[PDB]
Structure formats: C-alpha cells, structure tokens
C-alpha cells in the first residue's frame, strides 16, 4: 500500500513501455520497462516470477522471466535476456520466439506483464513458503542453508533469492550456488555473482561448471554429477533446501537423480 504496486491482480495483463536497451554481449541484453508511474514498484515477492505474453507470427507466446530489479526499485523493471537468434545454431534455424521478439522492440513499444506467479515464496531469514500445487496452502520450512543449481538463464531466479538474503544483514542463511553453462562465453551475470561473492563470502559459496572448458579453467568440467553435489552444495545432513532452474534436460536427468543419490529428499528439492 505504502508504495503503489503494479501487479495488482494476477488475472490482468499490464502493457509496460520499453524505455531502455543495453547490449551486454553479442546475444545478451538488459531491457528496462517503465512502471505505470515513477513511484510504483513492481509488486513481485522473492521466489516468484512474471510472464511476458505477445502475439508473435500469429501465435500467442507466453514465457516466464525473473527480473534482476527488485521491490526496492521505484519506477521501472529490468530484465536480462538471452537472445536465441535465427540462422545461428544450424540445428535451431528459427531461434527463440520471445527473445527475438524482445530484441526487435523499439523504445516506446509495450509488452504485457502478468504476475506474480510460482509455487515458492521466500519470507526471509531462512523461511520458505512452498505450495505443493497452485491451489493448496504453502508449507513453511525453515532452513539454515540453500543449495542452488542453475543453468543458463536459470541464474535469474537464484540471483533474486541471493540478493534478497545479502541485502538483509540479519539474514544468516548460507547460499551455495553451482552454475552450469556450455562455454565460458555463456556465464550470464558473472561480474554480479563475483562482486556478491567478494562481499558476502561467508554467506555465499560460488562454483561454476562448463561442458567445453577453456585450457585455463579453475572450476568444474562437464555435467552436474554426484561429486559436484557433494563438494559444492550443503550436505543432506544439514537439512538444506535445494533449488533448481535451467534447461529441462539438465534438471531432470543431471540434477534430480543425483540429488536423490546423495540423499536430499525430493521434498527439499524444488524446481522453478
Ligand atoms: C522461472 C524462470 C525464469 C526465467 N528467467 C529468465 C531470464 O531472466 N532471462 C531469460 O532470458 N530467460 C529466462 N527464462 C527463460 C524464458 O522463459 C525462455 O525459455 C527463454 O526466453 C527462451 O524463450 P524463446 O521464446 O525465445 O525461445 P524458444 O522459442 O522457446 O526457443 C525454443 C528453444 O530452442 C533452443 N534454441 C533456439 N534457438 C537457439 C539458438 N540460437 N541457440 C541455442 N538454442 C537455441 C533453446 O533451447 C530454446 O529455448 C526463465 C524461465 C523460467 C522458468
């Protein structure tokens, strides 16, 4: 109520105006959108995301994104987007629908936001409120540590939580992040993650892994396995929560079964 929220109902689409573009690398962008007034906030609880929706080439396309801005930000929302260009991966000649749609927007164009959405909310100081499904009440579990597995753009739901914890000097939850990508080129938001690690090392552990690592590389190599789970996530005996977001293949065949191997109950594993 104090600051006016933009996402007043989840059943409503809000056309937000694109006000700024930023080329980060060849295929990664930051887009900024104007909230309805400069004193609005988004209205997005930690742990949840929004959907963009648009009519692209005659079809309705809906996709989830987690902003890198937060409810402290007045007047705007920022998204970091990986663009899947056509005519690039000869085996995905068409590219990605939504990300190329965003790449093509001009300053002034609008796009429809809706939310908040998602089964998990972070309540602070270790309190996670997790719905078994969209229609049931949340179960509330209090952890002292959170393990996090992210592939590609899956980092933006981790970062939102990481930040939410580090802002709060009274939040002593320890976050352990294992970040998987294809090539060093593809470590999205590396400077942000490393600045946070520089300041908050006692509450933030960070480790990468790469499918095709360069010759000078100090971190993991290959897919997520038993050993990386043991070495870079809190142990199952600490009763940690474990969060996952990334390409469905990695989550389903690389993460979940090995999490089961090591001993993390599936009740303490959550996929965004
Ligand atoms: C909780 C959550 C948060 C998310 N946060 C973000 C975020 O912050 N930023 C973000 O950018 N995305 C985010 N996403 C992902 C986003 O929802 C989309 O999956 C992504 O934008 C791709 O959508 P698209 O329509 O463009 O691609 P699609 O049309 O769905 O593309 C189909 C698929 O083909 C493959 N593909 C196509 N072209 C290429 C190519 N050139 N190279 C390689 N593979 C290719 C990719 O696997 C691609 O996803 C998030 C998803 C979830 C669930």
Residue numbers in the entry: 4 to 275
What's the paper's own text on this?
Ubiquitin-fold modifier 1 (UFM1) is a UBL covalently conjugated with intracellular proteins through ufmylation, a reaction analogous to ubiquitylation.
CYB5R3 consists of an N-terminal long hydrophobic stretch sufficient to tightly anchor to the ER, and also FAD- and NADH-binding domains. All histograms from the data of 6 molecules were well fitted to double-Gaussian distribution whose peaks were at 2.3–2.9 nm (1st peak) and 4.2–5.1 nm (2nd peak). We manually modeled an open conformation of CYB5R3 by changing the arrangement between NADH and FAD domains at the hinge region (Leu147) so that it gives a predicted AFM image similar to the experimental one. The distance between the two lobes of the simulated open conformation was 4.0–4.7 nm, consistent with the value of the 2nd peak of the histogram obtained from the HS-AFM experiment. Since Lys214, the conjugation site for UFM1, was positioned at the interface between the NADH and FAD domains, its ufmylation would bias the equilibrium between closed and open conformations toward the open one, leading to the destruction of the FAD-binding groove and thereby reducing the enzymatic activity of CYB5R3. Remarkably, while free purified CYB5R3 exhibited a brilliant yellow color, the conjugated form was clear.
